[PDB]
């Protein structure tokens, strides 16, 4: 028996001026 | 038995002049 | 058996100029 | 009474392969 | 009575491989 | 009675590979 | 008598994940 | 008589996650 | 009589996670 969790969270709040901006959320799993 | 867990975060708040910024996020699991 | 538990965190609040700014968070499980 | 004078500039001349250029000019006032 | 005066001045002539430059500029004022 | 003056210069000539250059012009002023 | 030669290569095999990824080749030749 | 030669290589093999990647491959020449 | 060469070389194999990776290669030759 195998169990594999990924969790991931961007929160933003109040914000101004996000030029150019990266949001990157990248997961991989492998057997 | 096997088990994995991974967690990740950012908040951010009240925030002004992100130019240019980047967030990554990377996860790999593997067997 | 096996556990493996990873975690990770980045708050932040009232902030200006985060010009140029990267976070980075960078996770791996292997077996 | 309350004055708020803000100027950018950019010249550029006898220019070549300028590529993946940016030019960014980015102004606020606040009262 | 309150007075803010803000300059900024990007000049270049003659140029040759510009690859992947930048050129920013950024002003605030407050009150 | 209050004056703020804030002056910035970048002047380039006769370049060649500039390249992944950065010109950072960053001003603030409070009150 | 004058001669110029140039040469570039990229070669890549067996990839994944190559997000945001940039392959430059550039070439000037002058008399 | 003038004889001028450049090369250049990148070659790359069984690459995962290769983000945010820049691989750059610059020639120049002047007589 | 004149003569110039130049070689560069970058091999990469079984890697992971080469995340904000930078391969340069300049050349550059006169006369």
Excluded: A
């Excluded at 969790?5 to 057997?31: C, D, E, P, T």
């Amino acid at each position: 028996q195998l169990h594999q969790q990924q969790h991931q969270q961007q929160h933003q709040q109040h914000q101004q001026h996000q030029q150019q901006q990266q949001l990157h959320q990248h997961q991989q799993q492998l057997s």
